[PDB]
RNA sequence: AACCCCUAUACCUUCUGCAUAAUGAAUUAACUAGAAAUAACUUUGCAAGGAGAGCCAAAGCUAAGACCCCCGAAACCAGACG
């Protein structure tokens, strides 16, 4: 122990630390260069005549009149529609298992975006066209946790890993407004707005979320048993009977397709200051929020 | 008569042991050694980082600086529209305006252009670490004294001045109480009439004040306050939104 | 950050292992990060200078440097190039050795 | 000396003067009142009934949803027709 | 220095002082109101949202009136909202 | 010529005046005060500069945006002209491209 | 903050002390002396 | 280039660049070949295949394009079924 | 031993090259000219996360330090004044 204890007892015999004996760490304060004196004056590093010394050289990209590189290349739609492309932050099974082992995500309760964000497992940016998380297969071989997880996209192998261990995986759509709310609920509650309804997927995404192969949240529940059995056969494992599990009720807990949060209905106003919930009773309002 | 024995509330790392300081009182001239208080080693025995003290001290001096210095360019000086004399033929140097920076009474070429702000913010964790370093340095150099309370027998400033002299507390003493509202009236009266003995609440503690004052006095409640706030920075998540907004386990 | 839950068997499926209790009796100690992981980090500059950093080192950092030099010398075939920073309690190593150092530090019980 | 009282976040809802010309317009609307209620609750003094859309506002909300957000059955039917044409 | 009030608010301040203060309340309200004239020389969008052909995304649309110059002689007639462009 | 022939009056600085004695107090208002207040809120000065930093062009744009409507006619004219001059300097002139 | 050179007098005397034994104006006029002093050195 | 915009005091992107080049997150820029749609009747198959290739830019051009585009265009994107997803990260690259 | 002896083609700018008979300068005093992003580098903090909502992240991220002059046309336009 030559560090902590030697650095403090050696301070006992030194002058008091004061505002008169402070200095920056060496290397943190590079010297400033001024155009004064033989070395740095005279032409001051600007050269001689031309546009150079006078400060009027052409814009960046200009090549002296030759048709510039960045113009003579043909246009091509590499980035066409980039700002309207849906993005999904990848969440690997390695990362998910890591979060569970450290107690950052609780597998005893349903896992959705809110719990993933609250555990600092994933960072979602709705303003950057993130539409949620995509569960990726990386780490499937060593994934052991039993979870009920709700994601936006899931690979076939990732789904098989979840369901071989006795867990349940569902793919759930969130519109940009809903995604912002579900990711950061507290900032939303401070706006004093009724909880909005979750919008349906766009027409181009309806096939994905109505298909049992993807465990879509709008798919026919009667088709899941066959889909679950097919993966068990393909990847050589026996489909567990989760109906016999002690956590079966929790494993079945799923949000209504119009519900952003478990246990909270559209049109409810959360009063955090008084720790209350306000529910509208007007028939017209109730019809709007329930439709 | 019973000793005031304070223990560290928050978990101390297993490889480290608490440091200790005498608990004293201001009720009498010889009322030293009233107790013995343990102090968390990560707050009062961190590595002595003088470079970090410089960073935080320099931040404190400059982050709220606004310079009001301003000069006029050649465009803002009164007049100066016309060309003072023809370009050619007069034998004189060529000039375009009587308010050129070459001219007496002309504009300033590269003068101050205020108001100018110097605002910047060190990372929150760095500013918290600086406070830890300052407390450790004071303890390591025997400039830190822990009090049970700041209650004086009288409000006379001479008593407090004489007390510091007898106890060899240097020329200047920073007195830190837990809260502004609950400061004892006696210490408030004494310090209000002094210049080198300054009374501040715990929320007002800062590196610059600690370095300007030779001696630092903390009450036992203040010690608990400081350990809680500074150690919270070591074990906290990266924020999801400003800590002023509701969290599950914050505040307290 | 929540404290890691108790596990019947270690290492966990992810590979995490808690620090040994009591701490090892060595001249130096290596504190875990706030996320409870070993503080060994890869670093790169100039697009080509691959380096390894051991952070949060307490006690005799020079003793750690000697131990690291003995541990890595067989792998490299020569003495590793290192920089000891007593002020920050950091040891910087030329080359990428994060995986080997992490396991090596874990075996010591840090 | 003695330090001045620490600067504190002045509690209570702050209601600007509606008849003051220099009052920012954003502090006078219903959206500002809703934020006061969410922050302070009943102490705000905002009638909680004013938080949901009014009957006229609810009519506009429902019209926009009908125009731009089709039902699942409509989208599924449109998908089938498009698929048949491609086939 | 700066003015206490923005210059664009000066005219409204004048209406709160002097004889203008004592004008009828109903009349002062008529002055303050500034309804959008009926579109005469331009065709309104007719909707608040439109689908942009180039990218196929729903975009907000706004009606920006065309500035109209009414000659002084227009004030003795009835031009139906028409003026010079 | 050019140098004074007598010593200037001695400089008297009261290092323990109230302003200096209390310099820095509450600079940790947030860290030690549950983050109810940000330290930048302690900054006093022009409304367009509190807790913000920028180069002269950025400062000019910010001031015109925030208080341009309240500025005196002559002042606003100079500000608009300054913004134009700086736009040309920073975007078109200099050693580097 | 406006900074001005305050000790220019002494800077001039560093050169002129070497030019006292020169002939003519180059023994007192800095513009002239400095060139001749450099040449002398 | 606009180094400081009049409205925001921020750097601007040269949009001519965005219309022609793809930036891979690893720093590489991809482009098409000039003339790949020009006078195909007079060009041989081997030449026409060369002209259809998507090719990388050199160091100097890459540095230039980086300066002519703001940070937004250098972020890591996670587009669904991106054809270029595999090429965003280098493998087995020494020095 | 002041000089006499010996040695020695002012300075700046500009140029392939200037004692040049190329430029500027009587002299003194005062005044009079390098402003910033993109990256990278250096030194701290924390670290698969960083940052005091936004952003970035396949060791990153945050903070800081450190680079981008002066004078000069003939003109052009608007509104006044003759
Ligand atoms: K030079
Ligand atoms: K040189
Ligand atoms: K420039
Ligand atoms: K493109
Ligand atoms: K010259
Ligand atoms: K000649
Ligand atoms: K010549
Ligand atoms: K000549
Ligand atoms: Mg010169
Ligand atoms: Mg020249
Ligand atoms: Mg040339
Ligand atoms: Mg002028
Ligand atoms: Mg003119
Ligand atoms: Mg001119
Ligand atoms: Mg002047
Ligand atoms: Mg690095
Ligand atoms: Mg020649
Ligand atoms: Mg010659
Ligand atoms: Mg000559
Ligand atoms: Mg010539
Ligand atoms: Mg610069
Ligand atoms: Mg023209
Ligand atoms: Mg004209």
UniProtKB/Swiss-Prot annotation, chain A:
Component of the mitochondrial large ribosomal subunit (mt-LSU). Mature mammalian 55S mitochondrial ribosomes consist of a small (28S) and a large (39S) subunit. The 28S small subunit contains a 12S ribosomal RNA (12S mt-rRNA) and 30 different proteins. The 39S large subunit contains a 16S rRNA (16S mt-rRNA), a copy of mitochondrial valine transfer RNA (mt-tRNA(Val)), which plays an integral structural role, and 52 different proteins. The keyword DNA damage does not apply. The keyword Transit peptide applies. Residues 17-61 are annotated as: Disordered. Residues 31-47 have a biased composition (Basic residues). SUPFAM superfamilies: Ribosomal proteins L15p and L18e. One of its GO terms (molecular function) is structural constituent of ribosome. Pfam families: Ribosomal_L27A. It is found in: Mitochondrion. Keywords: Mitochondrion, Ribonucleoprotein, Ribosomal protein, Transit peptide. GO terms for cellular component: mitochondrial inner membrane; mitochondrial large ribosomal subunit; mitochondrion. Belongs to the universal ribosomal protein uL15 family. InterPro entries: Ribosomal_uL15, Ribosomal_uL15/eL18, Ribosomal_uL15/eL18_sf, Ribosomal_uL15_bac-type. One of its GO terms (biological process) is mitochondrial translation. The lineage of its organism: Eukaryota, Metazoa, Chordata, Craniata, Vertebrata. Residues 1-16 form a transit peptide. This is Large ribosomal subunit protein uL15m.
Swiss-Prot record, chain D:
Belongs to the mitochondrion-specific ribosomal protein mL64 family. Component of the mitochondrial large ribosomal subunit (mt-LSU). Mature mammalian 55S mitochondrial ribosomes consist of a small (28S) and a large (39S) subunit. The 28S small subunit contains a 12S ribosomal RNA (12S mt-rRNA) and 30 different proteins. The 39S large subunit contains a 16S rRNA (16S mt-rRNA), a copy of mitochondrial valine transfer RNA (mt-tRNA(Val)), which plays an integral structural role, and 52 different proteins. Interacts with GADD45A, GADD45B and GADD45G. Interacts with NR4A1 via the NR4A1 AB domain. Interacts with ATAD3A and ATAD3B. Transmembrane segments: none annotated. Residues 1-12 have a biased composition (Basic residues). It comes from Homo sapiens (Human). It is found in: Mitochondrion; Nucleus. Cells overexpressing GADD45GIP1 were more likely to be in G1 and less likely to be in S phase and grow more slowly than control cells. Inhibiting the expression of GADD45GIP1 promotes cell cycle progression. Widely expressed. Highly expressed in the thyroid gland, heart, lymph nodes, trachea and adrenal tissues. Expressed at lower level in liver skeletal muscle, kidney, pancreas, testis, ovary and stomach. Barely detectable in adrenal adenoma and papillary thyroid cancer. Induction: Down-regulated by p53/TP53 in apoptotic cells. This is Large ribosomal subunit protein mL64. Residues 1-22 are annotated as: Disordered.
Curated annotation (Swiss-Prot), chain F:
Keywords: Mitochondrion, Ribonucleoprotein, Ribosomal protein, Transit peptide. Component of the mitochondrial large ribosomal subunit (mt-LSU). Mature mammalian 55S mitochondrial ribosomes consist of a small (28S) and a large (39S) subunit. The 28S small subunit contains a 12S ribosomal RNA (12S mt-rRNA) and 30 different proteins. The 39S large subunit contains a 16S rRNA (16S mt-rRNA), a copy of mitochondrial valine transfer RNA (mt-tRNA(Val)), which plays an integral structural role, and 52 different proteins. Interacts with OXA1L. The lineage of its organism: Eukaryota, Metazoa, Chordata, Craniata, Vertebrata. GO terms for biological process: mitochondrial translation; translation. This is Large ribosomal subunit protein mL51. The keyword Mitochondrion applies. Belongs to the mitochondrion-specific ribosomal protein mL51 family. It comes from Homo sapiens. The gene is MRPL51. The keyword Mitochondrion applies. One of its GO terms (molecular function) is structural constituent of ribosome. It is found in: Mitochondrion. GO terms for cellular component: mitochondrial inner membrane; mitochondrial large ribosomal subunit; mitochondrial ribosome; mitochondrion.
Curated annotation (Swiss-Prot), chain H:
One of its GO terms (biological process) is mitochondrial translation. One of its GO terms (molecular function) is structural constituent of ribosome. It is found in: Mitochondrion. Keywords: Mitochondrion, Ribonucleoprotein, Ribosomal protein, Transit peptide. GO terms for cellular component: mitochondrial inner membrane; mitochondrial large ribosomal subunit; mitochondrial ribosome; mitochondrion. The keyword Ribonucleoprotein applies. Belongs to the bacterial ribosomal protein bL35 family. Component of the mitochondrial large ribosomal subunit (mt-LSU). Mature mammalian 55S mitochondrial ribosomes consist of a small (28S) and a large (39S) subunit. The 28S small subunit contains a 12S ribosomal RNA (12S mt-rRNA) and 30 different proteins. The 39S large subunit contains a 16S rRNA (16S mt-rRNA), a copy of mitochondrial valine transfer RNA (mt-tRNA(Val)), which plays an integral structural role, and 52 different proteins. This is Large ribosomal subunit protein bL35m. It comes from Homo sapiens.
């Amino acid at each position: 122990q030559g560090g902590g204890a030697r650095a403090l007892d050696l301070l006992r015999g030194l002058p008091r630390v004061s505002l008169a004996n402070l200095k920056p760490n060496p290397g943190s304060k590079k010297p400033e260069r001024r155009p004064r004196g033989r070395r740095r004056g005279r032409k001051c590093g600007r050269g001689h005549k031309g546009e150079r010394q006078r400060g009027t050289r052409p814009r960046l990209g200009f090549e002296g009149g030759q048709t510039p590189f960045y113009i003579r290349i043909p246009k091509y739609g590499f980035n066409e529609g980039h700002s309207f492309r849906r993005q999904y932050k990848p969440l690997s099974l390695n990362r998910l298992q890591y979060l569970i082992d450290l107690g950052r995500v609780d597998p005893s309760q349903p896992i959705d975006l809110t719990q993933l964000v609250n555990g600092r497992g994933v960072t979602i940016q709705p303003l950057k066209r993130d539409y949620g998380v995509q569960l990726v297969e990386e780490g499937a071989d060593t994934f052991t946790a039993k979870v009920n997880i709700e994601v936006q996209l899931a690979s076939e192998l990732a789904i098989a890993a979840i369901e071989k261990n006795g867990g349940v995986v569902t793919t759930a759509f969130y519109d940009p407004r809903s995604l912002d709310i579900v990711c950061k609920p507290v900032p939303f509650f401070l706006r004093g707005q009724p909880i909005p309804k979750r919008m349906l997927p766009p027409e181009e995404l309806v096939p994905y979320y109505t298909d049992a192969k993807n465990r879509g949240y709008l798919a026919d529940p009667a088709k899941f048993p066959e889909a679950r059995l097919e993966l068990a056969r393909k990847y050589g494992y026996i489909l567990p009977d989760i109906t016999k599990d002690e956590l079966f009720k929790m494993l079945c807990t799923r949000k209504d397709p119009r519900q952003i949060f478990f246990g909270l209905a559209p049109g409810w106003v959360v009063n955090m200051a008084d720790k209350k919930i306000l529910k509208p009773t007007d028939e017209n309002l109730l019809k709007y929020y329930t439709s | 008569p019973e000793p005031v024995l304070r223990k560290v509330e928050l978990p101390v790392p297993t490889h480290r042991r608490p440091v200790q300081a005498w608990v004293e009182s201001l009720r009498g001239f010889e009322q030293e050694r009233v107790g013995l208080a343990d102090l968390h080693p990560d707050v009062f025995a961190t590595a002595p980082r003088l470079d970090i003290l410089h960073q935080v001290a320099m931040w404190q001096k400059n982050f709220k600086r606004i310079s009001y210095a301003k000069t006029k360019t050649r465009a803002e000086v009164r007049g100066g529209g016309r060309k003072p004399w023809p370009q050619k033929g007069t034998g004189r140097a060529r000039h375009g305006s009587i308010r050129s920076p070459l001219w007496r009474g002309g504009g300033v070429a590269h003068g101050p252009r205020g108001p100018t702000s110097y605002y910047y913010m060190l990372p929150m964790k760095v500013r918290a670490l600086g406070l830890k370093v300052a407390l450790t340095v004071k303890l390591a150099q025997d400039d830190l004294h822990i009090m049970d309370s700041l209650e004086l027998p009288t409000g006379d400033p001479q008593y407090l001045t004489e007390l510091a002299h007898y106890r060899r507390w240097g020329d200047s003493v920073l007195l830190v109480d837990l809260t502004h509202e609950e400061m004892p009236q006696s210490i408030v009266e004494a310090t209000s009439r002094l210049k080198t003995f300054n009374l501040i609440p715990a929320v007002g503690l800062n590196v610059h004040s600690m370095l300007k004052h030779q001696t630092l006095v903390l009450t036992l409640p203040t010690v608990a306050f400081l350990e809680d706030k500074l150690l919270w920075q070591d074990s906290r998540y990266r924020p999801l939104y400003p800590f002023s907004l509701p969290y599950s386990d914050f505040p307290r | 950050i929540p404290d890691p839950p108790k596990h019947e068997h270690y290492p966990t499926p992810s590979g995490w292992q808690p620090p040994r209790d009591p701490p090892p009796n060595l001249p130096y100690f290596v504190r875990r990060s706030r996320m409870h992981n070993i503080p060994v980090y890869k670093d790169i500059t100039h697009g080509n200078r691959q380096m390894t950093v051991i952070r949060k080192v307490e006690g005799d950092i020079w003793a750690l440097q000697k131990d690291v030099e003995d541990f890595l010398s067989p792998l490299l075939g020569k003495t590793p190039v290192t920089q000891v920073n007593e002020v920050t309690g950091t040891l910087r190593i030329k080359g990428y050795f994060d995986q080997e150092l992490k396991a090596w530090l874990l075996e010591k019980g840090f | 000396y003695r330090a001045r009282p620490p600067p504190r976040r002045r509690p209570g809802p702050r209601w600007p003067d509606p008849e003051d010309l220099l009052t920012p317009r954003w502090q006078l609307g219903p959206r500002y009142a809703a934020k006061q209620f969410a922050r302070y609750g009943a102490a705000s003094g905002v009638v909680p009934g004013s938080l949901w859309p009014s009957p006229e506002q609810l009519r506009e909300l429902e019209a926009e949803e009908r125009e731009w957000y089709p039902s699942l059955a409509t989208m599924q039917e449109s998908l089938r027709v498009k698929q048949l044409a491609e086939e | 220095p700066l003015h206490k009030y923005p210059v664009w608010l000066w005219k409204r301040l004048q209406l709160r002082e002097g004889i203008c203060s004592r004008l009828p309340g109903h009349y002062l309200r008529s002055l303050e109101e500034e309804r959008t004239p009926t579109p005469v020389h331009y065709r309104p969008h007719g909707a608040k949202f439109k689908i942009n052909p180039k990218n196929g995304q729903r975009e907000r649309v706004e009606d920006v009136p065309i500035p109209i110059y009414f000659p002084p002689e227009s004030q003795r007639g009835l031009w139906g909202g028409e003026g010079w462009i | 010529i050019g140098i004074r022939l007598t010593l200037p009056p001695p400089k008297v600085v009261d290092r323990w005046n109230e302003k200096r004695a209390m310099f820095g107090v509450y600079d940790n208002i947030g860290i030690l005060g549950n983050f109810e207040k940000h330290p930048k809120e302690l900054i006093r000065g022009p409304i367009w500069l509190r807790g913000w930093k920028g180069n002269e062009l950025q400062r000019c744009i910010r001031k015109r945006k925030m208080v341009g409507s309240r500025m005196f006619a002559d002042d606003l004219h100079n500000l608009n002209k300054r913004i134009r001059y700086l736009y040309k300097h920073f975007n078109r002139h200099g050693k580097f491209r | 903050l406006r900074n001005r050179v305050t000790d220019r007098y002494f800077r001039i005397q560093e050169v002129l002390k070497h030019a006292r034994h020169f002939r003519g104006r180059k023994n007192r006029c800095y513009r002239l002396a400095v060139r001749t002093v450099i040449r002398a050195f | 280039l606009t180094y400081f915009s009049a409205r925001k005091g921020k750097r601007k992107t040269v949009k001519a660049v965005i219309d022609r080049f793809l930036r891979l997150h690893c720093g590489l820029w991809v482009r098409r070949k000039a003339g790949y749609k020009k006078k195909l009747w007079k060009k041989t198959p081997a030449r026409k295949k060369r002209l259809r290739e998507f090719v990388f830019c050199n160091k100097t051009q890459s540095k230039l394009l980086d300066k002519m585009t703001t940070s937004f265009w250098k972020r890591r994107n996670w587009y669904v079924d991106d054809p270029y997803q595999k090429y965003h990260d280098r493998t087995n690259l020494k020095v």
